[PDB]
Design a protein around this nucleic acid. Structure first.
Ligand SMILES: Nc1ncnc2c1ncn2[C@@H]1O[C@H](COP(=O)(O)OP(=O)(O)OP(=O)(O)O)[C@@H](O)[C@H]1O
Lengths: 310, 270, 307, 445, 461
DNA sequence: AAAAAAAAAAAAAAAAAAAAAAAAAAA
DNA sequence: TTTTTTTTTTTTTTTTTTTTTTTTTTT
């Protein structure tokens, strides 16, 4: 079944255009352990996620020998948020009332090096990927800029940040953080490309959103999603001078920051815009529940003087 | 355990196959999976020159390519009969023993999106200001290329049941009973005409159209199965498809073999 | 007879011209009689020629014959024998596609539906009784085409590969607009006695005599030139190749060229084999080498013919 | 005299080989183009070979069209004036009275192939047209036996494979299209017979349905006398009846099982019977008509094959006899052995001092160049091209065989009179022989 | 035995036994020029097949036949080819022969069922390899298309690709160091690509160091789990510490197939480079050593060839010359005879696809007639140079051989010609041959009395 | 039966035409 | 502004040279 199972799961993952939540792979495993009738009763979800990780390790040995890879990244909007969004769509078709730990790991299928062989693996023309790069530089440039105002109570970043603040402190008598900075440009500016037309950008953004990398927020704004990790993994951001996380040093463009005057002041000694320390929502949760309440760069206090990033 | 060290050695002594899997796995992502041999050679002549090895006989790296593509994930390169490693044109195709009895998962979780993507008889996909959540539910494929098998199982199941012959106007007047417009209005999910869908369907060699010429009357054309639908399908699985469409279980289906064959004869031919 | 060939070729051309309308007609309807309305004419035009069996007409005939067999093929494919029991007929499977593509539709709009080797004997009021009520929907948006798009992807053998962006995002741009005036406007095109073998024979049998004899000592020589003194040798070689001069060396040393005069007898029934076997008495050739300095030594024998 | 038109009138040269712009008209049936070779001799014939739809690979005077261009120019074009003005012509109602075909080749891009009408109106710019107009005029330009190549003669005589001469001769005199098309039509007939043998099973199914429907009619209206035909004396209706009701349950179960077979009623049973009967009795007619048509086609095909065998034997013997009759001018002779098993054209020639049959590669020069002419002139009556061209038939043979070549080719161009001729030899036969009989012309560059 | 002017390696007089039209006939050659002539198919162009078969040559070098015994006159049993050749003072190391005899006779007697029969050197039994090496040592080769061309290969000259033209025009003296130089070049060419692959192995080492960074990350993750395992004792500070270590450890570390992924795969890549580069350098040094000596003499030879060729070519009507090319890295050194036939056209190459029969024949003659001094060859066999040649291009191609064979220091020109033009220009030392035929010839099969009688060189015997 | 060039065979290399797409001009 | 024609580019399919390999005459 080793051939069979390790042959099924990769098909599952690269059929879905790449990205696929962990609680779907762990159910496909129960699908295929019954398709070859290898039933099990002495197991819990721990052995199951262990076996899934083992199979992914074997498949990754083979693929890394071939030149592709199955990364294992986290989506940074948090356990409760992602389990809500996923197992909220599993209420009509559901398996046998099994319990799943609210997980966040997102296996992704990407190529390591931009060789000449996989140079042409696209549906897009020249102008279309030119627009893609132009759009993503607009995404990061709009990300660097912070502005003042009232932050909405509609996005899930905001509700979750407030919930975990209240749960950690216990004292609910706290106000809103007074700024926001978005890595998600609005539509009307990306529509303003020079060479292409408007309807072209319309249907092109629709196509990209269908290719599982340009998720569109509830307000009608799109960012960049889990096929960012296939794109200049960290110099994608340090190129436009965006730093990384704190608790894990992986990427983060949405979560919690503290851009107050202390951890501020990007390095003008060299000119590179090395901005503030950025957390992930679960990263921020742990850093505030079991470490401190202070920005580590220049000793701030962020439970009152933090930033919303969206 | 022979498989892992076997494929390791295979990819080791042969570094042109490792730089060929990552070509045929990125020419046929989901578009036309045919690869002409002329091209397969014009790329292997350059992916072995800059590889520090004398390129071996085609019938060696062919078995090598099949061994790689079968071991890592489950694919297969295969030559189609053009009217073995001598087929003038090769296609990819899956080869793992299918698991319908639990591909229930992959049919359900891609059928469920109908209850959420069209309400009140309109498609809500091109609504830009909408809360797209697919990456968190793992929507099992695209949607401008899922109603391209949606309309390609109701054009190659109305040629698989008229004895490999259906005229043009008959096919249009047999599709208009499904709602697919034909005067020139784009089909309102995948945003394309019907004549251009058929033309691009010809370019993928799913069907073949027969051109005639009559200066006084005009031209009529017929839609007989091409080659890709003959190799990337099969009677052993067309029985499965048509056994599910009728929803009849394994008891009242014994006749389906000869029932299909005496109504489909010159389709599974060369 | 050329006229018959001309006119029957014209008839072949006419039938081949109307053949395309014939083929379109049989393609549309499915009637065999057009394969015979022209078969009678081609059989006629075939048998109409009886005196010369001229190729090319058979070639046109071969093209007409493959065409007639082709029309027969088109017609023979178009037979349809429908049963009442066979549960795979067209209007019983399109009305099952249009069954499966709307089960979720019937559960969504809550418009419920009720029940209305076997040798294939009879079954009609179970697979055409209530599998035909689903036959009046003609709008696209009603069917979940996301369920017979995803019954061809996990039943067929489609090749499910995805789209990677690390590679194609790093291609080069193309500002390589071609060169103006590589080379245009040329338009410059400016509107602006060799054989003479019988001469020696007509000298021989007019001056020497029908059985006279001379030598190298008399014939090939020339007192002034060397050209005309070797061209004579080559003409002699041609003549003796034609078998018209007798050259057998006497033991005196000089050669003997005498006019081979066969006493006039045109009967060849044995003269032909006599000549053929006398040549088969192989003439191991006399390599008649002549140099430039010894052209003046063998004038006649001691430097005198006519200097 | 009557000349079935299709004879090339004018060659118009624009930047070809070694000629910028010169145009010289052709003659009636035999023309002499002489001078110095290369200096306007094989260029004209290469123009005639290419501008009739042939590549330059099989010409041996330039392996690429783009190499044939005058060095000092960018585009070459050659105008070929066919003659469509007499019997057997090609669509005199559209193409005027003199077809004009030309081919424009340039150092890049695609070569230009155009049909132009008489006045100048461009007809169709396709390569499938020029390959159709001459196919109508039936001029085979590719194979050497019609258009001989100055550089390919000396190798064609000896160096050609045993199968080369055979296949060229066969497909040159149209004798192979017949075999190919007849075998192809036989294959079509075999596939059609297989489809008919498949249709026989469906017709058997229809027959079974018709007979069982008749059985249903019988088993339906068998209960007529039991409950209905007793209407005789009951007109008074519409005591002592001791044995009235006997088998009411048996008749009830019988009627139940009879009407509950699938769900049709009595009239509906008879209706299905009638429908299946009409289906059977129409499919019978269609099947039998198709069978008769196929059988008549097959018998016509057999009558084609026997005539093909006869025509092949006749053409081969005509070639053999005219070959020998031309060889007997130099007092030696041989025979052509069309071995249909190994597919050869072995030329067995003998001299004036031999015995056993010699080889085809043994003899040379005199027993070669004069076998070239002797094999070619046995492929000019079978092949019926409207035009013919010779370029240095005397590749290496002296002056006493050039005369026995010229005075034989002039004669063999009197028996047939539909073919125009152009001969390319650098020698001097202008006013040297008695060629004053009209139909010839002198053209020295 | 008037060997007064015969240069060594030459042939003096032929005598034939049982050939295709020669049952017993004996030639009597000349030292300078023997213009073979005669009527068509008179067995006069067979003396060339005889020299090619009597100097132990192959059968394919003529083209007349394909098999070896096809020259045995059908009707006979065995064929005898007796030919005499002047002895050389430089040719030695030969069995059954001394160095005093001034005349050696090589004779090969071909049988029926035995193509490869025995030979005959001065009436002594000799094997095949011995006579082959002897005829090689007589500085006479027959494959050199610039020296020995048969009737069925006269215009197989222009169909010779350039590279082979250089090889077969410089193998008139010696240049095997050009072959070893090509071997050196290909060794350098493969070494260059191997070096570039090593320069990519450098990036492999860089990637391995990055993977070592990931290894250290995996060890720190293992350290987190070490703390987690060491402190698990639920029997409040301790509890708080346990909760601050659970989420701290990333639950996605894929070091399983990375920890011991690569330890010793790079030292084997770094076990070949330095002395391999030094060997590339010494290969370049030896290549320069070999290339430095070649060019000067190899271009001086070609300059002499060009001067003589142009002085001979100006008679046709327009200029032309031969130019060497050394463009590629020595594996495609090639020569191109460049010709102009009238002024306004440019200077073009020589190949089949360019010029006619006449122009290519003029080139094939004038190239191998001006390559005279610069090679050691006693006899040359020009074969019936009339294919597509008119009068002006035949009188000249003949006059420019006569005035080369009668100026001084003449090698043997074997010239056969069925055609014959009036008013040529003859000179002293030439020997006009001929071949007779016709059943009126006194067949000397039994009586060798009149086997040569008629030649005007032995007027009193 | 242990070397040999040999015959013959398969299998890649370049060439030319056709079709699709884009650009440019006229109405 | 839109449609049609020109034009360039790409793709596919034939043909000339070229290598291969079992068979095969042979020492
Ligand atoms: N195998 C053979 N056996 C016997 N006789 C032969 C054989 N081959 C050729 N011959 C005869 O011998 C003659 C050979 O003469 P040769 O080869 O010189 O002809 P040629 O080269 O055409 O003459 P030229 O080139 O001088 O015009 C031919 O005429 C031929 O009939």
């Amino acid at each position: 079944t080793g051939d069979a199972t390790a042959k099924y799961l990769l098909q599952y993952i690269l059929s879905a255009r790449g990205i696929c939540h962990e609680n779907a792979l762990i159910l496909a495993l129960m699908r295929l352990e019954t398709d070859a009738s290898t039933l099990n009763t002495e197991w819990s979800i721990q052995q199951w996620v262990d076996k899934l990780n083992d199979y992914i390790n074997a498949i990754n040995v083979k693929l890394n020998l071939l030149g592709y890879k199955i990364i294992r990244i986290n989506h940074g909007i948090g356990r409760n948020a992602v389990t809500l969004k996923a197992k909220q769509n599993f209420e009509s078709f559901e398996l046998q009332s099994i319990v799943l730990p609210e997980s966040n790991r997102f296996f992704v299928y990407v190529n390591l090096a931009s060789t000449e062989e996989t140079k042409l693996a696209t549906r897009f023309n020249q102008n279309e990927i030119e627009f893609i790069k132009w759009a993503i530089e607009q995404f990061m440039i709009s990300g660097e800029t912070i502005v003042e105002g009232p932050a909405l109570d509609t996005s899930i970043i905001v509700r979750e940040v407030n919930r975990i603040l209240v749960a950690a402190t216990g004292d609910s008598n706290l106000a809103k953080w007074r700024k926001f900075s978005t890595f998600t440009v609005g539509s009307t500016n990306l529509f303003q490309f020079q060479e292409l037309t408007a309807t072209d950008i319309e249907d092109l953004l629709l196509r990209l959103c269908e290719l599982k990398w340009f998720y569109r927020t509830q307000e009608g704004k799109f960012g960049i999603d889990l096929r960012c990790i296939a794109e200049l993994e960290e110099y994608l951001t340090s190129m436009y001078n965006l730093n990384t996380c704190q608790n894990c040093h992986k990427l983060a463009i949405q979560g919690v920051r503290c851009g107050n005057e202390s951890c501020r002041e990007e390095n003008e000694e060299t000119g590179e815009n090395s901005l503030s320390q950025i957390w992930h929502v679960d990263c921020f949760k742990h850093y505030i529940t079991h470490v401190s309440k202070n920005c580590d760069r220049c000793g701030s206090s962020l439970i009152t003087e933090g930033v919303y990033v969206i | 355990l022979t498989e892992d060290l076997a494929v390791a050695k295979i990819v080791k002594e042969n570094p042109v196959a490792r730089k060929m899997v990552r070509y045929i796995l990125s020419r046929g992502e989901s578009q036309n999976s045919i690869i002409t041999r002329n091209k397969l050679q014009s790329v292997i002549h350059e992916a072995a020159r800059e590889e520090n090895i004398a390129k071996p006989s085609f019938s060696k790296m062919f078995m090598d390519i099949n061994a790689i593509l079968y071991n890592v994930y489950g694919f297969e390169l295969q030559g189609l009969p053009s009217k073995g490693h001598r087929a003038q044109k090769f296609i990819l195709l899956n080869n793992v023993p299918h698991s319908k009895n639990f591909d229930d998962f992959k049919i359900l979780q891609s059928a469920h999106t109908y209850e959420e993507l069209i309400v009140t008889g309109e498609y809500i996909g091109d609504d830009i200001a909408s809360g797209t959540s697919n990456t968190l539910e793992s929507k099992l494929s695209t949607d401008r290329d899922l109603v391209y098998k949606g309309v390609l199982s109701v054009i190659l199941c109305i040629v698989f049941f008229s004895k490999n012959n259906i005229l043009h106007q008959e096919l249009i007047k047999f599709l208009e009973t499904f709602g697919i417009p034909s005067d020139g209005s784009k089909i309102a999910i995948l945003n394309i005409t019907i004549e251009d869908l058929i033309k691009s369907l010809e370019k993928r060699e799913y069907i073949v159209r027969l051109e005639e010429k009559s200066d006084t009357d005009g031209e009529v054309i017929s839609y007989r199965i091409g080659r890709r639908t003959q190799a990337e399908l099969g009677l052993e699985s067309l029985e499965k498809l048509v056994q599910e469409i009728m929803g009849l279980e394994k008891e009242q289906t014994k006749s389906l073999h000869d029932d299909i064959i005496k109504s489909i004869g010159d389709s599974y031919s060369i | 007879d050329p006229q018959l060939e001309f006119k029957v070729l014209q008839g072949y051309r006419d039938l081949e011209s109307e053949m395309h309308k014939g083929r379109a007609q049989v393609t549309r309807t499915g009637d065999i009689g057009v394969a015979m309305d022209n078969l009678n004419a081609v059989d006629s035009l075939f048998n109409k020629v009886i005196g010369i069996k001229n190729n090319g007409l058979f070639a046109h005939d071969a093209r007409a014959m493959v065409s007639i067999s082709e029309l027969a093929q088109i017609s023979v494919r178009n037979l349809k024998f429908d049963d009442s029991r066979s549960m795979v007929n067209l209007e019983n499977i399109v009305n099952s596609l249009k069954r499966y593509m709307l089960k979720e539709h019937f559960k969504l709009n809550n418009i419920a539906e009720n029940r209305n080797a076997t040798s294939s004997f009879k079954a009609t009021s179970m697979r055409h009784s209530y599998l035909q009520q689903f036959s009046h929907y003609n709008e696209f948006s009603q069917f979940n085409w996301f369920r017979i798009g995803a019954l061809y992807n996990t039943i067929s053998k489609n090749a499910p590969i995805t789209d990677h962006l690390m590679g194609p995002l790093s291609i080069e741009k193309k500002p390589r607009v071609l060169t103006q005036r590589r080379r245009n406007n040329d338009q410059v095109g400016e509107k602006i006695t060799p054989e003479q073998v019988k001469k020696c024979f007509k000298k021989l049998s007019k001056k020497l005599g029908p059985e006279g004899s001379i030598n190298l000592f008399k014939f090939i020589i020339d007192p002034n030139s060397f050209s005309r003194s070797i061209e004579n040798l080559f003409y002699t070689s041609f003549l003796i190749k034609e078998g018209k001069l007798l050259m057998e060396h006497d033991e005196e040393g000089l050669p003997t060229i005498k006019i081979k005069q066969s006493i006039s007898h045109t009967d060849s029934r044995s003269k032909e084999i006599e000549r053929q076997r006398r040549r088969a008495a192989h003439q191991n050739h006399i390599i008649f080498q002549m140099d430039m300095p010894t052209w003046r030594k063998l004038i006649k024998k001691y430097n005198i013919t006519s200097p | 005299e009557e000349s079935p038109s299709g004879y090339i009138k004018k060659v118009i040269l624009r930047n070809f080989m070694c000629h910028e712009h010169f145009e010289l008209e052709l003659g009636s049936r035999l023309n002499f183009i002489v001078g110095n070779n290369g200096s306007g001799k094989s260029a004209i014939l290469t123009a005639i070979t290419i501008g009739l739809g042939a590549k330059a690979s099989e010409t041996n005077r330039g392996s690429s069209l783009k190499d044939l261009i005058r060095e000092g120019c960018y585009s070459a074009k050659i105008i070929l004036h066919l003659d469509n003005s007499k019997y057997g012509a090609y669509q005199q109602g559209i193409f005027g009275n003199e077809i004009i075909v030309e081919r424009i080749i340039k150092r890049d891009g695609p070569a230009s192939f155009s049909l132009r009408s008489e006045n100048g109106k461009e007809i169709s710019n396709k390569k499938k047209d020029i390959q159709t107009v001459v196919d109508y005029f039936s001029v085979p330009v590719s194979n050497p036996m019609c258009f001989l190549s100055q550089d390919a003669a000396r190798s064609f005589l000896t160096a050609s494979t045993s199968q080369d001469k055979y296949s060229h001769f066969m497909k040159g005199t149209l004798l192979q299209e017949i075999t190919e098309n007849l075998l192809y039509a036989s294959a079509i007939h075999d596939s059609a017979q297989e489809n008919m043998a498949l249709h026989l099973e469906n017709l058997k199914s229809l027959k079974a349905e018709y007979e069982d429907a008749k059985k249903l009619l019988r088993e339906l209206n068998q209960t007529s006398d039991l409950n209905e035909r007793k209407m005789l004396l009951q007109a008074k209706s519409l005591d002592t009846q001791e044995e009235i009701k006997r088998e009411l349950d048996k008749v009830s179960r019988m009627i139940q099982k009879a009407e509950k077979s699938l769900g049709l009623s009595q009239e509906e049973v008879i209706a299905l019977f009638e429908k299946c009967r009409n289906k059977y009795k129409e499919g019978q007619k269609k099947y039998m008509e198709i069978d008769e048509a196929l059988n008549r086609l097959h018998n016509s095909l057999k009558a084609r094959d026997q005539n093909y065998k006869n025509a092949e034997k006749g053409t081969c013997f005509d070639a053999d006899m005219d070959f020998r009759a031309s060889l007997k001018v130099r007092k030696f002779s041989g025979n052509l052995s069309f071995i249909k098993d190994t597919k050869s054209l072995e030329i067995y020639i003998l001299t004036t001092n031999d015995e056993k049959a010699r080889n085809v590669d043994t003899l040379s020069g005199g027993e070669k160049s004069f076998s070239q002419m002797a094999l070619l002139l046995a492929t000019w009556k079978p092949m019926r091209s409207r035009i013919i061209a010779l370029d240095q038939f005397d590749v290496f043979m002296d002056q006493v065989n050039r005369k026995i070549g010229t005075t034989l080719i002039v004669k063999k161009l009197k028996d047939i009179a539909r073919t125009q001729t152009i001969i390319i030899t650098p020698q001097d036969i202008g006013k040297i022989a008695d060629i004053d009989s009209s139909g010839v012309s002198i053209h020295r560059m | 035995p008037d060997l007064s002017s015969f240069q060594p390696g030459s042939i003096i007089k032929i005598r034939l036994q049982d050939f295709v039209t020669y049952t017993l006939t004996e030639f009597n050659l000349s030292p300078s020029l023997n213009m073979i002539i005669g009527p068509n198919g008179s067995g006069k162009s067979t003396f060339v097949c005889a020299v090619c078969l009597g100097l132990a040559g192959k059968p394919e070098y003529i083209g007349r036949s394909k098999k070896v015994e096809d020259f045995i006159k059908n009707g006979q049993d065995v064929s005898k080819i007796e030919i005499t050749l002047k002895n050389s003072p430089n040719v030695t190391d030969i069995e059954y022969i001394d160095a005093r005899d001034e005349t050696i006779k090589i004779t090969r007697i071909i049988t029926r069922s035995k193509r490869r029969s025995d030979y005959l050197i001065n009436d002594y039994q000799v094997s095949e390899s011995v006579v082959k090496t002897l005829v090689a040592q007589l500085n006479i080769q027959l494959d050199n298309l610039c020296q020995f061309l048969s009737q069925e290969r006269v215009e197989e000259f222009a169909r010779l690709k350039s590279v082979k033209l250089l090889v077969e025009t410089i193998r008139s003296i010696d240049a095997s160091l050009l072959d070893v130089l090509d071997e050196l070049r290909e060794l350098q060419g493969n070494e260059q690509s191997l070096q570039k692959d090593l320069d990519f192995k450098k990036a492999k080492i860089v990637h391995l160091r990055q993977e070592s960074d990931k290894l250290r990350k995996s060890v720190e993750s293992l350290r987190d789990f070490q703390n987690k395992k060491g402190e698990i004792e639920l029997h409040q500070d301790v509890l708080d510490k346990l909760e601050s270590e659970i989420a701290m450890v990333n639950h996605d570390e894929s070091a399983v197939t990375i920890l011991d992924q690569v330890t010793a795969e790079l030292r084997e890549l770094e076990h070949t480079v330095p002395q391999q580069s030094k060997d590339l350098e010494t290969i370049k040094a030896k290549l320069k050593e070999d290339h430095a000596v070649l060019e000067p003499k190899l271009d001086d030879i070609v300059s002499k060839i060009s001067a003589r060729f142009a002085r001979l070519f100006n008679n046709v009507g327009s200029a032309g010359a031969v130019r060497l090319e050394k463009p590629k890295d020595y594996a495609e050194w090639k020569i191109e005879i460049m010709v102009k036939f009238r002024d306004n056209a440019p200077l073009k190459k020589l190949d089949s696809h360019t010029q006619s029969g006449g122009e290519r024949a003029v080139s094939t003659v004038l190239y191998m007639i001006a390559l005279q001094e610069f090679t050691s060859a006693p006899f040359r066999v020009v074969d019936q140079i009339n294919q597509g040649m008119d009068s002006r291009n035949e009188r000249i191609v003949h006059k420019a051989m006569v005035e080369n064979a009668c100026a001084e220091n003449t090698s043997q020109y074997f010239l056969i010609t069925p055609k014959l033009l009036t008013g040529l220009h003859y000179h002293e030392k030439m020997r006009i041959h001929c071949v007779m035929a016709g059943s009126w010839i006194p067949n000397p099969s039994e009586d060798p009395k009149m086997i040569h009688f008629g030649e005007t060189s032995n007027y009193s015997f």
